[PDB]
Curated annotation (Swiss-Prot), chain A:
Family to which this protein belongs: Belongs to the MPP10 family.
Shown chain mapped onto the complete sequence: 496 to 593 of 593
Location relative to the cell: Nucleus, Nucleolus
Function: Involved in nucleolar processing of pre-18S ribosomal RNA. Required for the early cleavages at sites A0, A1 and A2 during 18S ribosomal pre-RNA processing.
Protein name: U3 small nucleolar RNA-associated protein MPP10
Subunit structure: Component of a heterotrimeric complex containing IMP3, IMP4 and MPP10. Interacts with snoRNA U3. Component of the ribosomal small subunit (SSU) processome composed of at least 40 protein subunits and snoRNA U3. Interacts with the SSU processome subunits EMG1, IMP3, IMP4, KRR1, NOC4/UTP19, NOP1, RPS4A, RPS4B, RPS6A, RPS6B, RPS7A, RPS7B, RPS9A, RPS9B, RPS14A, RPS14B, UTP1-UTP18, UTP20-UTP22 and UTP25.
Species in which this protein is naturally found: Saccharomyces cerevisiae (strain ATCC 204508 / S288c)
Residue ranges of the TM segments: none
UniProtKB/Swiss-Prot annotation, chain B:
Protein name: U3 small nucleolar RNA-associated protein 12
Function: Involved in nucleolar processing of pre-18S ribosomal RNA.
Entry keyword Nucleus: yes
Annotated keywords: Nucleus, Repeat, Ribonucleoprotein, Ribosome biogenesis, rRNA processing, WD repeat
Subcellular location: Nucleus, Nucleolus
GO biological process, one term: maturation of SSU-rRNA from tricistronic rRNA transcript (SSU-rRNA, 5.8S rRNA, LSU-rRNA)
Gene3D superfamilies: YVTN repeat-like/Quinoprotein amine dehydrogenase (2.130.10.10)
CDD domains found in the cross-reference section: WD40
Curated annotation (Swiss-Prot), chain C:
Positions of WD repeats: 1-42, 44-82, 92-133
Cited function: Involved in nucleolar processing of pre-18S ribosomal RNA.
Coiled coil: none
Organism: Saccharomyces cerevisiae (strain ATCC 204508 / S288c)
Protein's name according to its UniProt entry: U3 small nucleolar RNA-associated protein 13
Cellular compartments annotated: Nucleus, Nucleolus
Superkingdom of source: Eukaryota
Something else known: Present with 8070 molecules/cell in log phase SD medium.
Assembly and interaction partners: Interacts with snoRNA U3. Interacts with MPP10. Component of the ribosomal small subunit (SSU) processome composed of at least 40 protein subunits and snoRNA U3.
Amino acid sequence: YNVGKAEKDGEIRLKNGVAMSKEELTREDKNRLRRALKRKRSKASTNIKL
Amino acid sequence: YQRFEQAAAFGVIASNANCVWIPAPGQLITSALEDVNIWDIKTGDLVSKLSDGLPPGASDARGAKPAECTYLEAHKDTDLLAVGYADGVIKVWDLMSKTVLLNFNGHKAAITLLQFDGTGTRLISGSKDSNIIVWDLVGEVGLYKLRSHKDSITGFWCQGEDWLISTSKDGMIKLWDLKTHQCIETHIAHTGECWGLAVKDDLLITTGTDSQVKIWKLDIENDKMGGKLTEMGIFEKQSKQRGLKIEFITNSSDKTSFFYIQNADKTIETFRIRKEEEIARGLKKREKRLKEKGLTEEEIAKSIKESYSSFILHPFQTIRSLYKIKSASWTTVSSSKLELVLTTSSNTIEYYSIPYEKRDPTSPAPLKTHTIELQGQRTDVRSIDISDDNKLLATASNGSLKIWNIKTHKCIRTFECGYALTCKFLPGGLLVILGTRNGELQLFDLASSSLLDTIEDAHDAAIWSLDLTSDGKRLVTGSADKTVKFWDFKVLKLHHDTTLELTDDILCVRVSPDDRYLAISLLDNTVKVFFLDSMKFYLSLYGHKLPVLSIDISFDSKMIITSSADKNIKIWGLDFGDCHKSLFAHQDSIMNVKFLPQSHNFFSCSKDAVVKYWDGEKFECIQKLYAHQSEVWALAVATDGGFVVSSSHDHSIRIWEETSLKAGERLMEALDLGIAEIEGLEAYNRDMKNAVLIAVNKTPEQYIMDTLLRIRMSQLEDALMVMPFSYVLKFLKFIDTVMQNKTLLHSHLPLICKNLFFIIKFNHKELVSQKNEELKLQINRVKTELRSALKSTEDDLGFNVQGLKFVKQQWNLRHNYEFVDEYDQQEKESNSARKRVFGTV
Amino acid sequence: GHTNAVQRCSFINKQKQLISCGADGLIKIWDCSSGECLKTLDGHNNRLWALSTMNDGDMIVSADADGVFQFWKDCTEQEIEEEQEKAKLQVEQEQSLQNYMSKGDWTNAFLLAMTLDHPMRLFNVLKRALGESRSVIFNEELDQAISILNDEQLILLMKRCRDWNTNAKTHTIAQRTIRCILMHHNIAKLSEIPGMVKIVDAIIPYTQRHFTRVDNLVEQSYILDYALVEMDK
């Protein structure tokens, strides 16, 4: 058993086992996690005149 | 090159902000784009103007458009004015000195609301960024941030220190406990956006997007964890549009209360609160009416609840103004009458007086007592002109023409005309000529102050442009009817002379100062130049992708500039029609370009709200002028060229005038601090029988423990070896002290165990040599508890694994198939057995 | 957008929308202003020749060639009414949850966390509730709450316990919660809940590893014994 992607779309689940549902997350947290996902993916006549 | 700066600005009476009325009908404070006006309602003249400084065009002045004022609040007792700006900067103004005192920068968007506390020592600000920040004026610092909202702060109420109610565009009512800086209660105001919020005693009213209005009772001290805000009932206002603002005002003599709901339409609906005796009188009455009707008592009790709102609220009167209302404020409340002040979107101030007696108003419609409309035009100025004497400025707008004195900035005369598109002075500056969109040509005489002559059939469609010869006796008009008509002045009246019909619509006509060339723009993107004396076709400029809007010919008749909606300025030589250069001037359509007299340098304005100064010989942008907030419709240059006049969509006319420790080392420092206090308290307690920890607010065990966590594991072992022994004795006592705190121990049990054993193993020889009896007791205590704590976790793991294995086997018995023949079972197990794919080489 | 011929068309919701029936048997609701298919209704397996609308299309009836009538009724406001009530309830639960955590009323916050399916908040409640316990398993009131959990909540809770157990830094919370379940539930019933066994099959291998560790921590702790016996000499 390898902890993978969250089955429920709203939930975000990481390899360390921490699960966060998007309703919980503050906006700064939501932005921060999105950026981390970005990095992880990357390494892998009238009208005119008037 | 010489420089241009904003010499003066006028024409804006009220901009996009609230209006603040100050008792002396009294004065009014209104926002004028980046400046604040103070008006006198009785006279209608400007009392004073607030401008921070850094006039547009100065080098120290910023290279971006100034931030427009977005909210105004003045504390009457202290006479301090707080001004909010579109960029999220709060400035505190001294009304007496007319200067800024405090400059707060804590919002990342426009400021939507400001509210002085009762004592005038703290200021609460809400901005579009969804944050509410409480400012301390005496401290000039932001105390704390409230950040539960997910959209712009629409309205909030804080009349006492302790509690605050806030509303936002997400449609939420959040109740804040100012001592904890937290949101206690959360309720959904409306299915969509919640815009207005007003609180009177327990009574609280909020407006949604739809005509529905909600009433809530504010039981502050309920302290049930819920119900401190509870819905009372729903009533519907007449206006189906959203309600922007709600404001209470109470009559001191009679204790009567009124409020209005500033709608997003042209209507303000005022309402009255019925007194308690009135409500009981009605409740008794309607129950009799319902009882006489035969309804059951249970039904009657329910219907009363359904008709709950009607008892407290009474529709008082509706105020209907000609223009869309921007902001409003109560002015005076009296038994005889009620008075309101409002500002519209069309740049005017309207003062409404309501005389009433007891329940209902005396007059069917309110009384308009005052208006301030002389120094502003309701509609955007489409064209402007400067008299040859450079004293009088003619400005044409939809439905009105106004004329201003460049020196005194005051309007002199006003004339009603059609949707005026172009306006020019006649030589001597004593007459004015206009071309309306309905196709008529109106002439006005300033001394007469009346329209002299109108030609109803000048053109079959809008007269898009209009120009005069240097002689001043001939007129050229360009219209969408695809024709150019020549008119003469004969004593004054107009006689049509000749008609030239072009293939496509005409957007501009320019006659050269030498009166030899007549430039015409067409909708087919081409500029046609003609010889004025003989009307013989001369040249066809081409290449503009979008139509040319303005044409301007140099004083020497050697350069012609074409500005188009394609964001390009093309300079051409009239000798051969060669395009000297195309300039990507602006970020949007370029509406007007004018040559400075006696020189090749020219100006340009566009929809991007920027006026740019250019060099006609080096083709380089000399200067950028950022003052306006929206489209710059028209531009004008003085005959001398001393100044330039620019008009914008924001109704402003502007005159531009020419002038370290490493791992281990950190741990050693932490041990010295924490164990210094642990020794201190124990000695203090024994006898009875610092700054950094207080600042961080952690107990000494946590501070050292916190430092241990921060050290990376790869550096941890190397960090521990560096410590001299004398700190190892300190380290051991720290572990011993942690032991009493069972919470810390089981939190970081693996970390303590790994570190403790490494210390002992590394310097075991030196440890054992010591004969200290106290050290022997400490390790004995440190021993026994590490075992119990470790055995505690060990016991939990042992219990669960054995129990779970029992869950597994028992389910196997009931729901697993068994093959008596062993060879079959192996095949079954192999397929059922889990399979995973790995790589080989 | 119709795969086959269109046999009926009628305006609904005044000028806003249009509904059409095709031979394929699919009823498509389009938006007149934008010309896009908002919704597709599929209640037939044959061609539709007739289509009647009543109250601007609030009631729509379509008859199949086989003889099947589908009686469609507008429910947009009804679904909107339901969601608004759910949203109102969903907000109150969140705010009540935040207040409880601040006050420390763990036994209630745990229930709210399970209902909302808040993993992070649930973990913090179980964590800092355990922290107080150090100073039967968790505490009398919370342990009672775990006992009352139904089959759906047990499966959800054990799923969280599975994921936490994988991480050696957080397993201590997972093991105690599992212990509380075994001690306060009929083990017979736990086996019968569908999907519990596969979850348990994943918990066991990680639990043994954590048992192999900690044990090694114990034997290493006997270095302190060797220090004392040496010092005593």
